[PDB]
Write a protein that binds this ligand. Structure first.
Ligand SMILES: CC1=C(COc2cccc([C@H](O)CCN)c2)C(C)(C)CCC1
Ligand SMILES: CC1=C(COc2cccc([C@H](O)CCN)c2)C(C)(C)CCC1
Ligand SMILES: CCCCCCCCCCCCCCCC(=O)O
Ligand SMILES: CCCCCCCCCCCCCCCC(=O)O
Ligand SMILES: [Fe+2]
Ligand SMILES: [Fe+2]
Lengths: 510, 510
């Protein structure tokens, strides 16, 4: 949890427009940048929060800004460029908001405002939002290369910003299809050297709980043998969605509603046999954005999640007007919001009818339960790994390359305090111990884990975070490096200019 | 949690018959009994597990044995007598099992086998089970005085072994009534000096979720202004219950079933206005035996519970044959049992229709939620205070006289390890810190808190526990005194004879 109030209101700098740079800045290093750290921290977020006099209203409406911190021989540069998407380009051309964004209707056609994440496919990198449009980008220069329409290649209306990437380059993702949820597989770059997106395919299909209302889906789980998909009670209303949007003045945010009665439905598929397994896993209602990690343990799937307790859409609390309020009013606004909680669910894969009425979770080191009912629904109760009052452990990361989809022990996260990001956290998921890094009037980003080249242990490496520090007599922002063992500070690299909020990113080794 | 396996199987001595004593034994004290500790630890449990060659089958079938540890000027005695109930008396007369016990049918009329608890009414003390029959006992001599039938005085089929006692002597309890749950109020002893049970009355009524199947109820919650009742999915089947029991050979255990669909329904009544409040609180399924404490905080009731996750009746795992198994088999049998968990629920008292769909729990120091749905049900999610794998924090106690029904911080409990009691625990409910006392091959009882008479702090005192220590090189059993601050040992008083399992009790000051 946090131990800090924010009465100065410096978090408002997270949502303040910035200019792109025409070339890299030098970042002033204090402490010592590890000499094994060679490569680029690439991150995405909004950078332009109004087009002239017309404002964007939602957190997810600002125009995509691609950020790069470069590391070589203990020295650090910083560079950033807006992504030349149709949304950005046409707004610059016409000097107004042209494309309708998530929570901002344009007045007189789907957004490609790729503000959320960036990921590798073959030898290319792609910025994304959660739509059918992804944007190829150049990771050295930050130049926009092209727009890609996923509809051209596979049958999906969108894809998440959280594809899973296996160690050989294979990419898996999930998307709505207007009625199912499709898993897309993009194969690795082959000897023919043609772009792998042209070899995309739908491998497996999950069913929908409602014919006319699919659930919002933000991420999913992957193990060597299984795909896990959590169907939440946050629904997309397709009657409102597919009507004339310039007629009654709609945006995406206006199409979401909450099913009060369904709770949460969890779904598994067999990955290698490409097959939906018909186990009716059920539990109480929550919003879900990020899976932490999933893995197999004997005949059980361990499903670690960042949850929000309730069925109201948490996105309702992320309008810029609210996030720009003063601290007492921020706290007040979050009182009635869903409560964040880290939870472990355990999904049995061997369902014996003879155990009807009993707990199937026979593993020795969990309190999670799964109860087989007579109607063959399997009711789940979680083990709570972390809980704090309006203190979210969010934007989780692990040592993904070696432990993703596999038994693990450590997760890193960004700590939210009534939605305001004010600390960095580490969680031991076996013992429930936590470590915190926190400074006053300092607003960090998602921590990203980088392994040491000779690591013997899971947490042998660093986490990198971009921190905004609007206290005057401090520099506006800096790149933070913490030791992944205890979250003790290793170095920071200060820059001369503000940096707005960023969501997700990656470290690209060189 | 426990840190100990039990391969020697010494816990079996908890379920072994013992002989009463004709007078007190001197207990050999080591360490130093506090000199302010003056009075009697009275506890109840089964003492006779077979009548000749006919065995009792269930944990709750053995004949009541009243225990007393006396404390005066640093010295300790131990005495124990079987309670001369109809069940015990008639079994001694006829040399067989005469009355049907909880899980033991008698072969050729309700049991009064008062093996569970003892409590004050007016100037008297009563041993009880959970039936309509309570047994007045003499706290100095341990003699059985009389049987009392609660049906003579008020309209209930039984009452729990956990009445709440207010500081002026007023007694509240809850019972089934064949269809409602009745709250019985026994007033304090008045100037007329007549027995307060003759002035008993039903003050308030809770409704049932099913006309023909009332829920098993073991305890309830009380604050200065409110009564809290948790209706669990463990149901009593009245069609089996009221049929001829010697016809198809039935006991009480045979009449329990589990409603798979209802989950848990929580109920509040206004105590001072004696009125059922019609708030439809709902949550996922669990067994509940013990409330820890309830209290009022602004317009919210805080409801601390020892839960068992699932709808299967935990009592199904407490047949003596199972508890007498070897350790590897005990652990195996408990794998599919409900998982114990300490949980804080928070019940809003101000329900605004305008907040439909949102979290009403606006308090600052909880992650518990309560969501108003459109059908006006209020769905609850708990804050988890303690969770360990088959490690129950059970038999909870607090500093009851000063903190019962009021804001509090500390709870003490008996720690179960796959149902085997092997440690003592303290839980800070605000911070979730725990303390443990544990020795190898030592099987403690419910810890009971005794304040230092001039304490101003909550945990300024001791806990007392009766510990069974089999295996040669130790005396069979002893009374343990721990400091309530840190659970560090203060003294122990060894005795020369075995002591079986005990459930509940009290300290009577002198
Ligand atoms: C095009 C599409 C969409 C549009 O999604 C958007 C549109 C704009 C902005 C975003 C943001 O990425 C949401 C926050 N990560 C998502 C849905 C996810 C709502 C449903 C499936 C189809
Ligand atoms: C006579 C009665 C009963 C009988 O209860 C019994 C009978 C025998 C023994 C016990 C034990 O007290 C249960 C464990 N604490 C309870 C119910 C509580 C099941 C329902 C209400 C009426
Ligand atoms: C650095 C962000 C701070 C402000 C927003 C914090 C609230 C986050 C709520 C949970 C995660 C929602 C998903 C956001 C990331 C994404 O778009 O993938
Ligand atoms: C010292 C007891 C050890 C064996 C039983 C432990 C399992 C208890 C399960 C939950 C509590 C059930 C109620 C038993 C006490 C009572 O009758 O009030
Ligand atoms: Fe995300
Ligand atoms: Fe009890």
């Amino acid at each position: 949890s946090s131990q800090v109030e924010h009465p100065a209101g410096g978090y408002k700098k997270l949502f303040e427009t910035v200019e792109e740079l025409s070339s890299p800045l030098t970042a002033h290093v204090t402490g010592r940048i590890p000499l094994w750290l060679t490569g680029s921290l690439l991150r995405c977020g909004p950078g332009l929060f109004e087009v002239g006099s017309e404002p964007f209203y939602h957190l997810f409406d600002g125009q995509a800004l691609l950020h790069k911190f470069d590391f070589k021989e203990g020295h650090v540069t910083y560079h950033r460029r807006f992504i030349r998407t149709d949304a950005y380009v046409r707004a610059m051309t016409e000097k107004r908001i042209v494309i309708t964004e998530f929570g901002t209707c344009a007045f007189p056609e789907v957004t490609d405002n790729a503000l959320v994440n960036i990921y590798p496919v073959g030898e290319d990198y792609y910025a994304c939002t959660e739509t059918n449009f992804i944007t190829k980008v150049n990771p050295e220069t930050l130049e926009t290369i092209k727009q890609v329409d996923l509809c051209n290649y596979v049958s999906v209306n969108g894809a998440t910003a959280h594809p899973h990437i296996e160690n050989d380059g294979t990419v898996y993702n999930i998307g709505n299809c207007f009625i199912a949820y499709n898993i897309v597989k993009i194969p690795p770059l082959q000897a023919d050297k043609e772009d792998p997106i042209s070899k995309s395919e739908i491998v497996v299909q999950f069913p929908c709980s409602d014919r006319f209302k699919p659930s919002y889906v933000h991420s999913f789980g992957l193990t060597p043998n299984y795909i896990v998909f959590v169907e939440t009670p946050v629904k997309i209303n397709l009657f409102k969605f597919l009507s004339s949007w310039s007629l009654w003045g709609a945006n995406y945010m206006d199409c979401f509603e909450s099913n009060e009665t369904m709770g949460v439905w969890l779904h598994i598929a067999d990955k290698k046999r490409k097959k939906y397994i018909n186990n009716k896993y059920r539990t109480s209602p929550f919003n879900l954005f990020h899976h932490i990690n999933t893995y197999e343990d004997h005949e059980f799937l361990i499903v670690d999640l960042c949850c929000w307790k309730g069925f109201e859409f948490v996105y309702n609390y992320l309008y810029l007007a609210n996030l720009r309020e003063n601290w007492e009013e921020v706290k007040k606004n979050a009182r009635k919001a869903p409560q964040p909680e880290v939870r472990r669910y355990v999904l049995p894969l061997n369902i014996d009818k003879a155990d009807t009425g009993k707990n199937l979770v026979t593993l020795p080191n969990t309190t999670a339960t799964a109860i087989l009912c007579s109607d063959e629904t399997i009711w789940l109760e979680p083990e709570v790994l972390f809980s704090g009052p309006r203190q979210a452990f969010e934007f989780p990361q692990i040592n993904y390359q070696k432990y993703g989809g596999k038994p693990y022990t450590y997760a890193y996260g960004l700590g939210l305090n009534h939605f305001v990001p004010d600390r960095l956290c580490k969680l031991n998921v076996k013992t429930k111990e936590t470590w915190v890094w926190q400074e006053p009037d300092s607003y960090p980003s998602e921590p990203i884990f980088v392994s040491h080249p000779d690591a013997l242990e899971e947490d042998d490496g660093v986490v990198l975070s971009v921190v905004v520090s609007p206290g005057a007599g401090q520099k506006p922002a800096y790149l933070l490096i913490l030791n992944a063992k205890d979250l003790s500070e290793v170095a920071r690299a200060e820059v001369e200019i503000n940096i707005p909020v960023t969501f997700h990113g990656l470290f690209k080794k060189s």
